[PDB]
Amino acid sequence: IPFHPYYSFKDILGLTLMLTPFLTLALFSPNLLGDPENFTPANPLVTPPHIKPE
Amino acid sequence: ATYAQTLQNIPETNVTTLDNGLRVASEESSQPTCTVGVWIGAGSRYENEKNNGAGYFVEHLAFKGTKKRPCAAFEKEVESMGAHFNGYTSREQTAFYIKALSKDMPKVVELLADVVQNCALEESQIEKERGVILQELKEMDNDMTNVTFDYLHATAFQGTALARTVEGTTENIKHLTRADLASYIDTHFKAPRMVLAAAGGISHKELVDAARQHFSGVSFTYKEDAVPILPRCRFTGSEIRARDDALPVAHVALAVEGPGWADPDNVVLHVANAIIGRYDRTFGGGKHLSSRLAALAVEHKLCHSFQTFNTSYSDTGLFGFHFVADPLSIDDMMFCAQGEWMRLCTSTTESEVKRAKNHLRSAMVAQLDGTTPVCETIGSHLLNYGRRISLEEWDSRISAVDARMVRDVCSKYIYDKCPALAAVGPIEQLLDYNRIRSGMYWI
Numbered sequence: 001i002p003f004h005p006y007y008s009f010k011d012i013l014g015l016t017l018m019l020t021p022f023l024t025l026a027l028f029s030p031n032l033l034g035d036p037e038n039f040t041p042a043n044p045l046v047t048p049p050h051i052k053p054e
Numbered sequence: 055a056t057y058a059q060t061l062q063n064i065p066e067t068n069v070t071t072l073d074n075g076l077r078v079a080s081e082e083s084s085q086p087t088c089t090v091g092v093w094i095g096a097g098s099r100y101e102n103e104k105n106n107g108a109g110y111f112v113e114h115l116a117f118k119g120t121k122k123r124p125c126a127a128f129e130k131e132v133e134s135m136g137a138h139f140n141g142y143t144s145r146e147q148t149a150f151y152i153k154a155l156s157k158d159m160p161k162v163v164e165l166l167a168d169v170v171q172n173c174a175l176e177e178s179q180i181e182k183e184r185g186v187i188l189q190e191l192k193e194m195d196n197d198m199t200n201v202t203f204d205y206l207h208a209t210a211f212q213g214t215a216l217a218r219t220v221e222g223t224t225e226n227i228k229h230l231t232r233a234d235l236a237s238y239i240d241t242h243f244k245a246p247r248m249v250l251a252a253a254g255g256i257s258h259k260e261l262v263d264a265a266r267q268h269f270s271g272v273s274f275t276y277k278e279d280a281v282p283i284l285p286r287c288r289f290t291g292s293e294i295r296a297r298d299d300a301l302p303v304a305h306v307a308l309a310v311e312g313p314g315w316a317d318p319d320n321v322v323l324h325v326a327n328a329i330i331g332r333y334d335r336t337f338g339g340g341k342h343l344s345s346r347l348a349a350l351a352v353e354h355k356l357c358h359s360f361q362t363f364n365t366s367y368s369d370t371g372l373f374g375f376h377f378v379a380d381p382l383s384i385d386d387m388m389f390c391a392q393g394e395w396m397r398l399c400t401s402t403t404e405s406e407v408k409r410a411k412n413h414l415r416s417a418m419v420a421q422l423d424g425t426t427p428v429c430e431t432i433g434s435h436l437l438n439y440g441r442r443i444s445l446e447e448w449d450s451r452i453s454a455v456d457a458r459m460v461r462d463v464c465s466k467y468i469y470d471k472c473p474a475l476a477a478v479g480p481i482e483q484l485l486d487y488n489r490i491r492s493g494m495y496w497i
């Protein structure tokens with residue numbers, strides 16, 4: 001079937017479905033996924049107790 | 055002698071009605087030869103699931119002899135006088151007519167009446183025709199154009215009566231009984247639903263007389279003289295796709311619901327179809343044809359042929375087009391076609407309608423080229439409009455049509471409508487319904 005309108009519509013739908021969590025996280029829990037340690041200017045002389053990646 | 059004058063001087067069409075309810079109409083000329091026949095308001099639409107294809111089965115026996123005179127006798131008599139006996143059955147109309155010397159107009163009328171009233175329905179002849187009809191169904195199955203139009207009706211009017219084909223189902227043809235055909239004839243071939251029409255060198259009064267003599271058997275009750283109004287057939291925007299990449303070319307038909315006989319708009323739709331026209335690879339005109347679609351077809355080799363149509367019926371109809379093309383040029387053709395339909399509703403020109411009006415006039419005049427075609431006009435007119443419509447009236451109506459009117463009427467029946475689609479053959483390149491539906495607006 002032609003990509004349009006079948007998948008153009010299906011894809012826009014998919015976009016808004018995944019956009020809700022994104023925006024909910026972004027607007028209601030901005031720092032849920034980030035280390036609080038990154039709100040402290042880099043200090044070459046002090047290493048954080050628990051260095052964990054994103 | 056101007057066009058106008060010639061139109062006014064055409065002999066009038068005379069109509070008179072017998073007590074049994076039958077109507078007798080005829081247009082008189084000075085021709086030694088003539089055509090007379092009985093146009094019945096019957097067809098597949100009047101049938102149903104059990105007796106579908108009966109009207110067709112009957113059309114096969116209506117010439118194999120009556121009670122007063124068996125096969126051989128009936129045939130010899132007609133042949134020996136140099137008369138031609140033809141007929142046909144469609145969805146809403148049937149007809150049996152004869153061509154001969156005006157000198158026999160009366161003997162013929164007797165012959166017709168004998169055919170429509172006393173068909174022999176020879177039990178043995180029935181089984182013989184059962185096998186013949188089955189052979190014609192296989193022959194017609196290779197007529198893509200007709201397979202395509204059948205499918206167009208099958209889907210456009212799905213669920214209703216107009217969905218059935220005229221020839222009928224295989225099962226029905228294999229099981230229709232002598233009694234069913236009999237029943238069919240009795241139920242439908244009735245005076246008030248028939249029309250005795252004749253054209254050529256004939257006396258209207260002499261015609262009506264022979265008519266009184268042979269078309270008698272009057273009715274007693276009220277249920278016998280009332281013309282039954284048929285239940286409405288629902289139009290459905292949809293598509294049926296029969297794919298067979300083994301076929302050389304593909305047939306495609308698109309259509310929207312039309313108004314129906316009695317509606318004046320039909321004059322405009324016919325002018326509209328005149329603008330788009332039709333085409334086929336043997337039109338010398340070539341790339342210079344007035345029809346834009348035709349010109350494009352030639353330039354880009356979009357199709358082998360294409361045609362517009364406005365098929366009317368009592369309460370509905372099919373307005374659309376049909377084209378034949380190679381598997382690889384279907385998409386462009388459909389594109390240009392739907393494009394022209396949009397142009398109609400949106401940008402029709404005065405020049406365009408001027409030409410189309412002329413083309414349409416000579417088209418109507420051409421449908422009265424002979425006794426049979428004129429006789430066909432009469433039968434149909436009384437049967438559809440309940441009166442003959444002169445070329446002068448048509449011309450009067452055609453003349454009133456202008457660009458604006460075309461745009462408005464076309465916009466009315468075409469713009470943003472859900473069409474009925476039928477595609478047969480190597481149709482992989484024809485895009486989906488949704489894409490086609492979008493071709494229905496803006497353009």
Ligand SMILES: CSC1=N[C@@](C)(c2ccccc2)C(=O)N1Nc1ccccc1
Pocket residue numbers: 051052053054
């Ligand atoms: C510039 S530090 C960094 N870059 C990220 C986003 C990354 C690393 C590797 C590949 C892609 C992205 C990440 O998780 N970290 N943090 C981090 C913390 C502790 C140990 C390692 C990395």
